[PDB]
Amino acid sequence: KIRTLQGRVVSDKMEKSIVVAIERFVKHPIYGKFIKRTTKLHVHDENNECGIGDVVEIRECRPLSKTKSWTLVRVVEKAV
Amino acid sequence: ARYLGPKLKLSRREGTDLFLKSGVRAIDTKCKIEQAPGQHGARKPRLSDYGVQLREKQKVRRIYGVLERQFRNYYKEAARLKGNTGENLLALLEGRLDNVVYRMGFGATRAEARQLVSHKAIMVNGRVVNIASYQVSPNDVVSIREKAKKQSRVKAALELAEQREKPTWLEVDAGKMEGTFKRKPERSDLSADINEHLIVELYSK
Amino acid sequence: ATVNQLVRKPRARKVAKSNVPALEACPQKRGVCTRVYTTTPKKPNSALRKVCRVRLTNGFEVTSYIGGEGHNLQEHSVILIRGGRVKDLPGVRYHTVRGALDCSGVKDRKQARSKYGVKRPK
Amino acid sequence: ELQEKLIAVNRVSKTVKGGRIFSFTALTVVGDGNGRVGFGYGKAREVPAAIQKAMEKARRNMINVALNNGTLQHPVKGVHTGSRVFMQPASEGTGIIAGGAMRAVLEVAGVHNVLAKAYGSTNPINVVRATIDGLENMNSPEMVAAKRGKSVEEIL
Amino acid sequence: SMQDPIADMLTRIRNGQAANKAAVTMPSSKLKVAIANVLKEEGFIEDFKVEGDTKPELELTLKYFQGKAVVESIQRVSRPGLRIYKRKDELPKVMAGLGIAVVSTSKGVMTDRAARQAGLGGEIICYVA
Amino acid sequence: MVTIRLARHGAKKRPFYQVVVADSRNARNGRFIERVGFFNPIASEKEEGTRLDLDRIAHWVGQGATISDRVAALIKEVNKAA
RNA sequence: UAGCUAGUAGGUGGGGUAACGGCUCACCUAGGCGACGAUCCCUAGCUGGUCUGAGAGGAUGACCAGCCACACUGGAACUGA
RNA sequence: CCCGCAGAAGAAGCACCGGCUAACUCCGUGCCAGCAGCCGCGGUAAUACGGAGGGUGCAAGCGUUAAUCGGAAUUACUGGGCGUAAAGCGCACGCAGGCGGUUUGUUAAGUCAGAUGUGAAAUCCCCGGGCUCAACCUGGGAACUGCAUCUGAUACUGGCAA
Ligand SMILES: [Mg+2]
Ligand SMILES: [Mg+2]
Ligand SMILES: [Mg+2]
Ligand SMILES: [Mg+2]
Ligand SMILES: [Mg+2]
Ligand SMILES: [Mg+2]
Ligand SMILES: [Mg+2]
Ligand SMILES: [Mg+2]
Ligand SMILES: [Mg+2]
Ligand SMILES: [Mg+2]
Ligand SMILES: [Mg+2]
Ligand SMILES: [Mg+2]
Ligand SMILES: [Mg+2]
Ligand SMILES: [Mg+2]
Ligand SMILES: [Mg+2]
Ligand SMILES: [Mg+2]
Ligand SMILES: [Mg+2]
Ligand SMILES: [Mg+2]
Ligand SMILES: [Mg+2]
Ligand SMILES: [Mg+2]
Ligand SMILES: [Mg+2]
Ligand SMILES: [Mg+2]
Ligand SMILES: [Mg+2]
Ligand SMILES: [Mg+2]
Ligand SMILES: [Mg+2]
Ligand SMILES: [Mg+2]
Ligand SMILES: [Mg+2]
Ligand SMILES: [Mg+2]
Ligand SMILES: [Mg+2]
Ligand SMILES: [Mg+2]
């Protein structure tokens, strides 16, 4: 069992790399409202299999680029 | 520190008898206890809510001989301590060593008892204690040391204490000149004319 | 009011400025009397109130009231000023400290001697 | 037996053709300590007559309040013209911590320990009325058990 | 639009008690039936009855004691604009324990006292006094 | 290196030492890894005065921690008395 | 202050580091960030904590302790774990 | 720290007293001199300006100034408002965003429960201990409202399916 996060592929234009929004349902510190906040992450994916708008599971790894420290594990719900 | 002015002046201003003198003579004979001190003493102005609260606090402070900083610290400790705040405050003021000596009867006035304590006449559990504000604990023996056992004022004070009403929470032996602090004086043991709500409210503004 | 609106834009605390900005968060400040004169007070009252235009060490030139009966101040006289306005004097927001550098205490005072820099009589 | 105290005396004017006619208004509160409290408001050309009229009115129109060991039974709010009032059943020994008119009303009512605060307007007449109304709108465990058709042990 | 049916249910009860109506009816729901059951158990209403098959109507029979309403005040707490969740130690006491607080827990809708006894928190639906 | 030593605490003329294991480079009262006892030089009678967690001290010594002379004397005293 | 960014965003290969990496270079791709506030401007060492407050909060970061930065000003490396 | 010597011997001041706010009279002065945090006071009987007597409050300190929070529910999350007191866009359409009638299934993201790791020490709080007491020092606990992981619950919210 390893720590991993699910998210939607925002963009896949740069080769072998994708952008994965990992939006989280946090609560506001003061007012108590539950606000949807988003976390964009550059994820490394070999074979460029992922498309935009899909869902992907990713895990943390050693840094592969200036902004890329996450790697794809599996693609799920990749409909268009 | 200590108030060094006329004591019957404080008694007249407050209105009641604060036991600031030995009590051989009536306070009505020693002074005009009814009239307030000063040029405008005969006039009796109407006191407001803050006035009566301040009056009550001043009465307690003058009776026990405690200044504002020490009294405020006593209130803070009493509020912190569990239980009734006013009762705890009264219990602490009773716990004061000079008050204990006066209650046992080794002093005509609380000032005289404080005089003995300061001049190193008092042993607590075989330890010469010099501070008047020393908090006496239950099951503590308080004795007059042999140096002061020869003082005639102690014997005269013992006679005056025999005249006064004896406290139940202490047990004093006059021949040995030593008393045991049995327990904390309850509110029923303490005087009824003293009101605690006013003090608590005044310091809880 | 709505928590959604508050999340979008919180409540911005109302910054209250100080009424004595020449002191610059200092209890007192030193200055030089540029001019000593008297002024007429505001409408409901009347007098000749003694004031000083003072150049402060931090560049500001302010006007300061001179409390007490009589003063020895003149031009080119270093004084110490503190906060506090005289109300019925337009633009005067500072008091001179009696009993300070090159400022004498009020003569023949027996009460409020500490406020007017008067030493204890024998 | 009935403890009474005068809260405020106010001078008012009428401004008649001749000049101004002044008169005095007295706000008083009486109570038995055991729980009954009632306020009175009177008016006369002179202060003693106004106070006496207020005392009579206060003696009349009393209301019973369910007191639990000399303090409130639950936190209670009270509202009126401007006065919004909150009162809390504080522990024994704390004393009555309240501002002015509320202090007078609660003291004559007989509550010895409360934590109160007056929001909104603090006009003596309105705050006294709001405090009395809040005390009125305060039910006891016996009352709630009876109305809900249960025992006090089921309510706790 | 209708955003919160539960607040509508509580408003109907409050308005009915104010207007001295014997019964109040509303479009029935599963959550509404659970809340009505809790109210009847606590004794703030006399009875409830769900009636109908396609679109059932829940009918509550209001309760009066001496000409005054039994439900003195009933306030919605959690709402769509602001959800309220509490842990078992933070469960509120309505009217110093005299009133009840409806809390939706993992084990169904129950009063705050029952949830506290169970030892678990949940979403605080409403206060009833 | 890692060592067991005394850190001075208390008031003027009334020292009270905390027996702590810490990197030698750190300051006397500064950063420390673990507090494994205390020592009171002015402790009166009817008082333990010293308290050393011998298990933790043994563990750290096995790890390779050196011991100051005063702490060694305290360990000697504790073992002798006990 | 509404647009900012060409080593800039990613890839392949060499080089470099104790270590991963545009850290550096050559080539290839045309990306990357930003209204959930990028960029720009003003102010500011951060925290445990301190003061106040019923609480929530507000103000603050002296002394003690942890971390960071600096050593006349601006650069640079050498020695060395 | 203890013992001895002598002798009340060497040791009290500051602010305030019109209301807010505990504490009043006389004399001097006459919209002058002056006071003042606010309201205000002073033009010939000033409890508000100066002096005196008396008193009140603190006390080896007492006042003034500066600064922060409080009172201020006067930035309102707890905890405000918008017909006339400040406040509903001149009116509509509508993207992002916020919110979502009812039933069943499923998931377990939000939510809840338990456990584990961590949340430095000091500080705060509770029960004690040592300085003659206190400040101060100190033992043990509690707390650090948090974060992460794992195991469960499925009422509500969310996702998916009908
Ligand atoms: Mg108002
Ligand atoms: Mg490379
Ligand atoms: Mg290589
Ligand atoms: Mg990198
Ligand atoms: Mg700086
Ligand atoms: Mg507050
Ligand atoms: Mg900060
Ligand atoms: Mg410094
Ligand atoms: Mg220099
Ligand atoms: Mg250099
Ligand atoms: Mg070397
Ligand atoms: Mg080298
Ligand atoms: Mg007065
Ligand atoms: Mg004055
Ligand atoms: Mg006169
Ligand atoms: Mg005067
Ligand atoms: Mg200030
Ligand atoms: Mg506020
Ligand atoms: Mg308003
Ligand atoms: Mg208008
Ligand atoms: Mg308007
Ligand atoms: Mg319109
Ligand atoms: Mg729904
Ligand atoms: Mg939605
Ligand atoms: Mg979950
Ligand atoms: Mg800690
Ligand atoms: Mg002790
Ligand atoms: Mg401790
Ligand atoms: Mg679900
Ligand atoms: Mg669902």
Coordinates of N, CA, C and O in Angstrom, one line a residue, chain F residues 39-71:
Chain F
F39 N 19.5 16.5 38.2 CA 20.4 16.5 39.4 C 20.2 17.8 40.1 O 20.3 18.8 39.5
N40 N 20.1 17.7 41.4 CA 19.9 18.8 42.3 C 21.1 18.9 43.3 O 21.1 18.1 44.3
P41 N 22.1 19.7 43.1 CA 23.2 19.8 44.1 C 22.8 20.2 45.5 O 23.3 19.8 46.5
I42 N 21.8 21.2 45.6 CA 21.4 21.8 46.8 C 20.2 21.1 47.4 O 19.5 21.7 48.3
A43 N 19.8 19.9 46.9 CA 18.6 19.2 47.4 C 18.8 18.9 48.9 O 19.8 18.4 49.3
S44 N 17.8 19.2 49.7 CA 17.8 19.0 51.1 C 17.5 17.5 51.5 O 17.3 16.7 50.6
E45 N 17.5 17.2 52.7 CA 17.2 15.9 53.2 C 15.7 15.6 52.9 O 14.9 16.5 52.7
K46 N 15.3 14.3 52.9 CA 14.0 13.8 52.6 C 13.7 14.1 51.1 O 12.5 14.3 50.8
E47 N 14.7 14.2 50.3 CA 14.5 14.5 48.8 C 15.5 13.6 48.1 O 16.6 13.3 48.5
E48 N 15.0 13.0 46.9 CA 15.9 12.1 46.1 C 17.1 12.9 45.6 O 18.2 12.4 45.6
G49 N 16.9 14.1 45.1 CA 18.0 14.9 44.6 C 18.4 14.5 43.2 O 18.5 15.4 42.3
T50 N 18.7 13.2 43.0 CA 19.1 12.7 41.7 C 18.0 11.7 41.2 O 17.4 11.0 41.9
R51 N 17.9 11.7 39.8 CA 17.0 10.8 39.2 C 17.6 10.5 37.8 O 17.6 11.5 37.0
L52 N 18.0 9.3 37.5 CA 18.6 8.9 36.3 C 17.9 7.8 35.7 O 17.6 6.8 36.3
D53 N 17.4 7.9 34.4 CA 16.8 6.8 33.7 C 18.0 6.0 33.2 O 18.6 6.2 32.1
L54 N 18.3 4.9 33.9 CA 19.4 4.1 33.6 C 19.3 3.3 32.3 O 20.2 3.1 31.6
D55 N 18.0 2.9 32.0 CA 17.8 2.1 30.8 C 18.1 3.0 29.5 O 18.8 2.5 28.6
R56 N 17.6 4.2 29.5 CA 17.9 5.1 28.4 C 19.4 5.5 28.3 O 19.9 5.5 27.2
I57 N 20.0 5.7 29.4 CA 21.4 6.0 29.4 C 22.2 4.8 28.9 O 23.1 5.0 28.1
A58 N 21.9 3.6 29.3 CA 22.5 2.4 28.8 C 22.3 2.3 27.3 O 23.3 1.9 26.6
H59 N 21.1 2.5 26.8 CA 20.8 2.5 25.4 C 21.7 3.4 24.6 O 22.3 3.1 23.6
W60 N 21.8 4.7 25.1 CA 22.6 5.7 24.4 C 24.1 5.4 24.4 O 24.8 5.6 23.4
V61 N 24.6 4.9 25.6 CA 26.0 4.5 25.7 C 26.3 3.3 24.7 O 27.3 3.3 24.0
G62 N 25.4 2.3 24.6 CA 25.5 1.3 23.6 C 25.5 1.9 22.2 O 26.3 1.4 21.3
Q63 N 24.7 2.9 21.9 CA 24.7 3.6 20.6 C 26.1 4.3 20.4 O 26.5 4.5 19.2
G64 N 26.8 4.6 21.4 CA 28.1 5.2 21.3 C 28.2 6.6 21.9 O 29.0 7.4 21.4
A65 N 27.5 6.9 22.9 CA 27.4 8.2 23.5 C 28.5 8.3 24.6 O 28.5 7.4 25.5
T66 N 29.3 9.3 24.6 CA 30.2 9.5 25.7 C 29.5 10.2 26.9 O 28.4 10.6 26.8
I67 N 30.2 10.1 28.1 CA 29.6 10.5 29.3 C 30.6 11.5 30.0 O 31.8 11.3 30.1
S68 N 30.0 12.7 30.4 CA 30.8 13.7 31.1 C 31.2 13.1 32.5 O 30.5 12.2 33.0
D69 N 32.2 13.7 33.1 CA 32.7 13.2 34.4 C 31.7 13.4 35.5 O 31.5 12.5 36.3
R70 N 31.0 14.5 35.5 CA 30.0 14.7 36.5 C 28.8 13.7 36.4 O 28.3 13.1 37.4
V71 N 28.4 13.4 35.2 CA 27.3 12.4 35.0 C 27.8 11.0 35.3 O 27.1 10.2 35.9

